[PDB]
Design a protein around this ligand. Structure first.
Ligand code: NI
Length: 341
C-alpha cells in the first residue's frame, strides 16, 4: 500500500509510487527522476499515464521499454494542465532529467514536491519566486548539521588536478571512474576533457548516456575501450581485486590505475578538507573517495526552506524511524523560529 507522503491531496495524483500495484484513485503517476528507488515497479506492461521530463521519458522508453502512448513528457519552466490541474516542472539540480513539481490545487493550495534535489540559491529566481507555497514535500536525505560537503565545483577541481598530475607523471597510467546509476557524469567527463580522451564504457552504459541530451556527447564517450584512457566500470568493481583484474584485461597498455569512487557524504567529511584528501593505495593501484553530492547539504537545505517559508513540511527521506522523524521535526521548528515565519 502506497504511503501518505507519496499522495497529493485534492488530486488524483501520486509521485514516485510505481511499486504498490494499482493505487486506488490515481489518475496520473508522476516520476521525478530515473533512480531505481523511485521508478521501482515500472516496465513495458505499465498501462497508466506517466508524467515526467523529456530526459526521464527517453530513459523510460529505451531502458525500461515503457510504451510511448503512456509517456507524457512536459517541458520545464512551463505552466501545463494535467487532468484539470495546473502543474510546473522545475530543475532539481540532482541527476539528468530530475525535477521538482509545483501543483496548483483547485481550492487555492500550492504544493511543492522537491523529488531528490540539491538546493541552490538559483532556485530563489525560478517560478517559485512569484507565489506562496503552503505544503513542501522535502528531500531530507542529509537533514542534520554533521552533513557538510564542498561545492561540486571544488570537488571537480580536485579530481581534474589529481588526474592530470598522475597521467602527466606516468603516460602509461589508466584512470577509472565508478558508476551505478545516472548522475555525477561531470566527474568522468571533466577528467576525460583535461586528458584529451573520450570516456570508454560498456554498451549498456553508452545506451543510458545517449538518452540524456548532453551537448556534443558523441564527441565525449565511446564503446571502444582500446582508444580511451578514462574507463567507466560498475561501482562494485572499484576495489583492489576488481581493478587488478581490469588491468590484466588491458593487455599491457597500462602499468598503473588511478580510480575514483564518487560517494555521497562519508564521516571523513567531519575531519578532512577536500584539499587534504588522500587515496587508499596497494602497489600500482590507488583509490580516491570523493564527496560529490547530488543532495542538499544541511546548510543548503536550511537556506532554501527559510527562503520558501512553507506552512507545513512533509519529509520524504529518513521517515522510517522515530529518532529520525523527531530529529527532523526539531530542526524544522528551529528554522521557523530563527526566521520568524
Ligand atoms: Ni535520486
Amino acid at each position: 500500500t502506497c504511503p501518505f507522503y507519496k499522495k497529493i491531496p485534492g488530486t488524483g495524483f501520486t509521485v514516485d509510487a510505481f511499486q504498490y500495484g494499482v493505487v486506488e484513485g490515481c489518475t496520473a503517476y508522476f516520476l521525478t527522476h530515473f533512480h531505481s528507488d523511485h521508478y521501482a515497479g515500472l516496465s513495458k506492461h505499465f498501462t497508466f499515464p506517466v508524467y515526467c521530463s523529456e530526459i526521464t521519458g527517453n530513459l523510460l522508453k529505451n531502458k525500461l521499454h515503457v510504451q510511448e502512448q503512456y509517456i507524457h513528457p512536459l517541458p520545464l519552466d512551463t505552466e501545463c494542465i494535467v487532468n484539470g490541474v495546473k502543474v510546473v516542472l522545475l530543475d532539481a539540480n540532482h541527476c539528468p532529467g530530475a525535477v521538482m513539481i509545483l501543483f496548483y490545487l483547485p481550492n487555492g493550495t500550492v504544493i511543492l514536491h522537491t523529488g531528490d534535489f540539491r538546493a541552490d540559491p538559483s532556485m530563489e529566481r525560478s517560478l517559485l519566486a512569484d507565489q506562496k507555497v503552503h505544503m513542501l514535500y522535502l528531500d531530507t536525505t542529509y537533514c542534520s548539521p554533521e552533513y557538510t560537503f564542498p561545492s561540486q565545483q571544488e570537488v571537480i577541481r580536485f579530481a581534474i588536478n589529481t588526474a592530470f598530475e598522475a597521467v602527466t607523471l606516468n603516460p602509461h597510467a589508466l584512470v577509472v571512474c565508478g558508476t551505478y546509476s545516472i548522475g555525477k557524469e561531470k566527474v568522468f567527463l571533466a577528467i576525460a576533457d583535461v586528458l584529451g580522451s573520450k570516456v570508454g564504457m560498456s554498451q549498456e552504459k553508452y545506451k543510458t548516456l545517449q538518452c540524456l541530451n548532453i551537448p556534443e556527447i558523441n564527441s565525449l564517450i565511446t564503446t571502444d575501450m582500446c582508444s580511451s584512457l578514462v574507463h567507466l566500470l560498475p561501482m562494485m568493481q572499484i576495489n583492489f581485486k576488481g581493478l587488478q583484474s581490469h588491468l590484466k584485461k588491458c593487455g599491457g597498455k597500462y602499468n598503473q590505475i588511478l580510480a575514483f569512487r564518487p560517494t555521497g557524504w562519508t564521516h571523513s567529511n567531519k575531519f578532512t578538507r577536500i584539499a587534504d584528501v588522500i587515496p587508499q593505495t596497494k602497489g600500482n593501484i590507488s583509490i580516491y573517495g570523493i564527496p560529490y553530492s547530488e543532495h542538499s547539504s544541511y546548510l543548503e537545505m536550511k537556506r532554501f526552506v527559510q527562503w520558501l517559508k512553507p506552512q507545513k513540511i512533509i519529509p520524504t527521506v529518513n521517515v522510517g524511524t522515530w529518532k529520525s522523524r523527531s530529529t527532523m521535526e526539531k530542526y524544522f521548528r528551529e528554522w521557523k523560529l530563527e526566521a520568524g515565519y
